[PDB]
Every structure is written in C-alpha cells, then in structure tokens.
Amino acid sequence: ANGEDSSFGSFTFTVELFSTPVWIWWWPRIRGP
Amino acid sequence: MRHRKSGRQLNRNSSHRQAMFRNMAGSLVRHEIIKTTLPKAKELRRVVEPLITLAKTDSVANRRLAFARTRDNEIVAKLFNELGPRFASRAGGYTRILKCGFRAGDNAPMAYIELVDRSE
Amino acid sequence: MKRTFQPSVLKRNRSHGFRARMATKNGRQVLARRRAKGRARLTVSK
Amino acid sequence: METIAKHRHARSSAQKVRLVADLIRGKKVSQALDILTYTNKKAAVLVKKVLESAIANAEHNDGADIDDLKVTKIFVDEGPSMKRIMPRAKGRADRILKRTSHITVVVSD
Amino acid sequence: AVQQNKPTRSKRGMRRSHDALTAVTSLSVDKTSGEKHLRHHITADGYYRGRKVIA
RNA sequence: GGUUAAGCGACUAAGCGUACACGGUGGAUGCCCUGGCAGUCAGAGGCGAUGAAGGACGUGCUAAUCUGCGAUAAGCGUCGG
RNA sequence: CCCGGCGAGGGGAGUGAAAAAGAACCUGAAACCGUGUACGUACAAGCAGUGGGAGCACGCUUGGCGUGUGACUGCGUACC
RNA sequence: AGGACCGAACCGACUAAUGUUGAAAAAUUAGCGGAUGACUUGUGGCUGGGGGUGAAAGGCCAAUCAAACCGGGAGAUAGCU
RNA sequence: CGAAGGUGUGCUGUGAGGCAUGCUGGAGGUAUCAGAAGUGCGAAUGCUGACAUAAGUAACGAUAAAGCGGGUGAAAAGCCCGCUCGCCGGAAGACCAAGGGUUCCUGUCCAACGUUAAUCGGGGCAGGGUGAGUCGACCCCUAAGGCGAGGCCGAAAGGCGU
RNA sequence: GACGACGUUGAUAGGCCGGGUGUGUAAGCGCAGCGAUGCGUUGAGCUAACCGGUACUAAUGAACCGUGAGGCUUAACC
C-alpha cells in the first residue's frame, strides 16, 4: 500500500581527494649556519 | 587513590550532580518507580531514603527542610502526607533496585528503582 | 579570517561580464577562444 | 541437508561481525539464538537475523524439525567499501572506508 | 612514532588472539513464568524470582 | 598381583605457519566495436543588415534531459519520390 | 510462496542452453581477506633458504614409490 | 581646547599557555595598546608586472612576490642525478 | 562433439621456452617459411587503479547540563508532548542589506548524507507557498569614474578627449 | 585484568538506630526595643567518607566447567 520510492536522488555519491602542502619551520633543526 | 571515599561523581560537577539528584528524587516520589542507569540508582538511594526518614515526623521545620532539599511543594506534600505514614514502621530500605538490561542507545546498564510498597 | 573571495554580483558583472568582454578586442578574443573550445558557459553572466 | 541464508552488504566491518560469528559456530540453533540474544553487540542483531532466516528457509523450502538443526558453517566475507572523505587540519583530507561484509550462515542436521 | 617495517598478518593474528568474545553460558530460568533471563535481571515479561514486578 | 623409588614419555593450540579445497574483494586478461587515427579519389571553399556564428527562453497527451522546431513552435503549403 | 521493519538482503519456484548470465550482470587473473582439512609449533635466538633428515597424514602399491608437512642438524648478513 | 586623560563598542596584536595529522593552512584563553583622530568602517571607482603601490619591511599586488598568474616559444638547456 | 583467455597436473629441452590434457570458458585461433615492430620491466621519491599496515588504535569539533513520565515505532539518551533543571539576554533575542537560491510550509521514506542511533533533518520523493499607485527596484538627477559623434594624436592594434 | 571479603546457615554494601566529630545557640513562638537587633526556649539545629549495632533493601533455587582410579620400563618390596 505504501509503495516504493525507487528514486534515491542522492544515491550516486561522487568522491574526491585533495590536500595542501604545509609550511614547517626548520631553523633550529639546522646542523650548520 | 580514593580509600574510604564515598560518592560517585558520575562525570559531572558538584552543582550539576546536586540538581540532577534533586530532579530524580522528585520524579521517584511522584511516580514511585523510574528507570535509570544502575549507577544513578544506588546513588538515588542515599538521596531519597533520608527524605522519607525526614518525612516520618511531621513539623513545620521538617517541611521546610524537605522543601530545601526538594524545591517542590507537591513532592513535600506527598512525602509528609503519604510516604511517612506508609513507611512509619519500616527501619530503612524504602526502595528496591531491579536490574533490567542494557540501553539501546549506548549499552548502559539499566535498572528500575521503586518504593517497596507501591500500594501493593 | 577574511578570505580572498568576497562576492558582489555588480562587481562580478562589471569585471568579467559579457558586455565587459565585448568592450575590447582582447576580451572579444577571450570569447572567440571559448567558443572554439565549445564552452557551455561563455562568461560569468547569469 | 544444508540450508543457506546470507546478508550481503551488511553495514559493518568483517572483523566486528566475526567477533560474534565465532560465538555460535557449531552450536545447536536454539543455543545459538540464546547466545545471540544476550550478546551486547550491533553485529549480534545482524547475525541473529541471518540465523533466523536460515532456520525459516530450512523449515519451509526443505524438510523440518528446527529441533535438530545446528550451525554447521558460518563465515563473514568482506564486501565492497564505500570511499568517503574526512577533512583534517591544515587543508588536508583523509580517506574514510565504510567497510561492509557478507554474512553467511549454513544450517544443517 | 611509526613503524619501520610492515607487521605481518601473523603478528596481527597473534595480537588479536585476546579479542575473542565470551558467551554468557549461564541463562537462568524463572521459577514461575519459566522464561530464560539474565541472572539477577528482570525477565522480558517483567518477572523476577517468580514475582511479577513491572507489568 | 599390588606398593614405593629411579629413568624415559604420546595426548594440549590461546593463537600462528605451510600445503590443498572452497569462497569474498577486485578488476587484469582474452574476445568485441556505435569511437578514434592516417590517407587516397572527388567535391565545396565561405556565412552575415533579407540580421550570421554562438546562445537565452520556450514548444508535446505528460514535462526533467537529448534531438527537432519557433507564439503557425517534434511543426504549415506546394511540387515530386 | 517463505524469513525480514508492508525493509535491505536472502531461500525456494519459474524463464533461459546457461542465473557462480539476476541487472553491484561476458571472461574472470593478482595483491588483499576468510572457512574447512593434513602436518608442524608454547626451553627456544638472527635475510627464514638450501644440504641432510626422523616422525605423521594421504594416494598408489604390497615393503616400495609418489604427495603434503617437517622435529633435529651443517652452511648461510635481501635486491638495485 | 586637545594627533589631552581613564575606559566599553570598534580598530589592533605586546606577553604567556594551549594547539602543532589543530575547532583553525596564524586561531583560542587570560592579560595587553589606541579608543575625536596622521581614526575607523560600508558601497562604488582608479593605478598592472621591470609595472603598480609602499609613514620603507624587498612590505603588499586573490593562502603565490629580489619581479604575479594563465597560455604560448617548448620536448628551452642540463659536461648533473 | 568446445577457440582464445583463466586455473591445475604430467612430460620435455642447456636456457629464453615447448608439448599434452583435467576443470573453467563459450567463439574464435592459427603449422610452416618469410616479412614488420608501440617486441619482453622490480626498481626511475616512475604514472593510473585496486588493496594492505599502523588498528578496531587516535578522534567524534567549545567543560552552557541534564533528569524523569507519557507517545509513536521493529527498535528511543538524541524525535513529539509534559514537568523540572541549566545557559544567552547590547545576545546565543528580533528585523534587514550583501551573498545564497527553494534551504520555506505540509505529507511520506531512512539506502546514501548527518562524525553514533534515528521514528528526526537544511537529506530523498511528492504537493503547496511569495498578491503593492504608497515598501524596493525600474524611473528623473547628478559624484568619483567610464564610454565618447566630430576632433587631436599614434607603424597597425590603439591613446586622449569635446 | 588481577587480589581480598561476603551471597539468607548472611553484617558484603546501602538505608535505619545509637554515639562520636564538626559548625556553633536552627525554625516557630514569646519577651524587650520606634527600629536595626538582642534575650529565652537552647549549645540549639543540622552533621560526608568515622565507631558500635541492626536483615529494612539488594546479595535466587538453578545452570556452567572440571570426571569416572591415572603410561611404560627396570630396581627393590610385600
């Protein structure tokens, strides 16, 4: 009696992946200057 | 260490714990049986049984004390008019804890706490 | 923090809109390249 | 006679379901139902559903006598994972695997 | 902070050798209603030690 | 036969390994071609103020999308097949 | 038709040459993950093999041969 | 009266701690400076790359600056890995 | 009456390899002798896809706080109703501009999305909803500035300007 | 995790009773004072984790695991 939606207008989930380079501070790391 | 220390803090601060147990005691007096977690029972006992003991003897000062502990006049009236007379000859142990499984939402050990008479 | 994109439709159309592209021959060359590529949206005009 | 019931693409990783599956391997179906009833795991519900389905399938499509059925075989396989995204700090993004499992219960006498 | 070599599936299984669940194995039977229940717990129907307590 | 003593000692697997059997995941490989690539031969080398190229919005018995079409709107007239 | 939440999934029935061709669909490799069976493994130190080698389990055979495992032992510090 | 004083909004950013696969690709908490002025702010506009703008730090010019970004010369060149 | 491919087994050559046939597969494959090469991969912090490990570990995003009763439901810590408790109060209330673009209201559903569950939702599906002579835009007027008939300049492109 | 105590033939925990300890003379009422307040009843009332008691509440009858005389060889022994 209820029926079936059979639509799922959000079924296909598009997936990605991306990142960003990160600044690090190295000045006391140094074995030199 | 917590040697010889009594009282659960139940992941709350002091004022929150006080308010929650005031509410729970009012609820138990109102409904005579409530469903709680097992550790919140076993602590409600130490809050609600002294209330009944206080209600055993009826006086203006005692009613004011009960109002201070339970800021609800309906609860004070029920204590002093029914529960004190009902438990007048009982020497403590006015409540009963029954374990009743685990909560669906978080698997918390549940229990029923109720007054031993409940008008049976 | 304030980020670089601070939208405003009027500024958007005045800077990159269709009539702004058509005003100069370099902007008209931008439109020709986009027509040659077959872009669905020629400009920011909407 | 062996009777099979499966739950494919169950929303739970195979490790978690296997924790519960090893509880009932080789047991009589009534004992397995009790064990699953009093196990506090999400996967216990799923495995109980599959076991009940297998018992019903045996009784209906095959012969009968729930009383001499046993959990002859049980195994959980990995299903396809759904790839998702978790945003992390400093503009990074991480892969989230929403692992699923195929649950199979074989019941027999 | 992080491994220098990938651990083997053997080591993974060895670690998980303590993760096995334990069954209750100790269901009690109520004296009046006859239903199974956890020891020291209410039955599903609200009995305990043969007395209807919840209803 | 029993009882002490000395000596030696299969059976355990929480788990793990190797082999094999059967599966899962995954999508390679083979097979396929409405798609491309490079040419040969032959055309045509322009469209536009009689409003183009390219679009916007519409148009159906229904109204997302594609194709066509333009308030005469998946079409109208006429001549041929 | 049945279990299930008037689910998702599944088991039957039926179609079909084929349904482990069931739409997450031709064929289905590998990494990776499991269930079952045989053998080894809880007093023993290291590139994990190779040379020797009991014992056990299978098949053939009628003690042997083949197959798996491999206690113990000599030698042995990956590749570019 | 005041580039006057104390102090909220508002504008800054001196110290500490936390955070450092952050709640955040510069923040939070506790304090801190200015707070009628060489102030601060909305909405528009103009200046374009050896160029702009700069109370000047090689500061800023879309999280990019001792010469932006996009496309092209272009498969630059690489006695080096 | 079973090709290529896949997967085992046996035999065989000094090697790259070859041959045979069990299973799978379901339509193609090619002796021989020549001919031509996108002709052989373990490495290049190689490229693309899939799958591990750490590990069922860290974390679940402000320390303003929750407790009971009833309802619905397959299932309720989280939804609805009620009573208490707590937090903001020059805001964490109310109304807009900018920007967004149906997120608004009602009914239904719970796959995916929601850092858990979900009967709930700014999620899926369907239906509804925005009414102006006076509010705003458009419109009249101009600022900065832009464009600019002729014009003045400039190899061309174009610059400036009445 | 473990370790210890106890499970109705019971003081294991909570409550309750008595005490102690701490704070310091509750509330209500009465009196004095115009009033703030003071005084009496009154060291009163409250009192956590403490001490000594007490089955009032909870520690359920089951069920589960673990077996059924324990290898061989010699040497003495009875």
Swiss-Prot record, chain A:
This is Gelation factor. F-actin cross-linking protein. The lineage of its organism: Eukaryota, Amoebozoa, Evosea, Eumycetozoa, Dictyostelia. The rod domain contains six 100-residue motifs that appear to have a cross-beta conformation. The gene is abpC. The chain holds residues 751 to 765 of 857 of the full protein. Homodimer. It comes from the Eukaryota.
From Swiss-Prot, chain B:
Signal peptide: none annotated. Belongs to the bacterial ribosomal protein bL17 family. The lineage of its organism: Bacteria, Pseudomonadati, Pseudomonadota, Gammaproteobacteria, Enterobacterales. InterPro entries: Ribosomal_bL17 (IPR000456), Ribosomal_bL17_CS (IPR047859), Ribosomal_bL17_sf (IPR036373). Pfam families: Ribosomal_L17. Gene3D superfamilies: Ribosomal protein L17. One of its GO terms (molecular function) is structural constituent of ribosome. This is Large ribosomal subunit protein bL17. Keywords: Ribonucleoprotein, Ribosomal protein.
Swiss-Prot record, chain C:
GO terms for cellular component: cytoplasm; cytosolic large ribosomal subunit. The keyword Repeat does not apply. Keywords: Ribonucleoprotein, Ribosomal protein. One of its GO terms (biological process) is cytoplasmic translation. GO terms for molecular function: structural constituent of ribosome. The keyword Acetylation does not apply. InterPro entries: Ribosomal_bL34, Ribosomal_bL34_CS. Part of the 50S ribosomal subunit. PANTHER family: LARGE RIBOSOMAL SUBUNIT PROTEIN BL34M, MITOCHONDRIAL RIBOSOMAL PROTEIN 34 FAMILY MEMBER. Belongs to the bacterial ribosomal protein bL34 family. This is Large ribosomal subunit protein bL34. It comes from Escherichia coli (strain K12).
Curated annotation (Swiss-Prot), chain D:
The wild-type allele (erythromycin sensitive) is dominant over the resistant allele, and is also dominant over the temperature-sensitive allele at both low and high temperatures. GO terms for cellular component: cytoplasm; cytosol; cytosolic large ribosomal subunit; large ribosomal subunit. Part of the 50S ribosomal subunit. In TnaC-stalled ribosomes forms part of the binding pocket for L-Trp with the leader peptide and uL4. Belongs to the universal ribosomal protein uL22 family. Pfam families: Ribosomal_L22 (PF00237). This is Large ribosomal subunit protein uL22. L-tryptophan binds at residue 90. The lineage of its organism: Bacteria, Pseudomonadati, Pseudomonadota, Gammaproteobacteria, Enterobacterales.
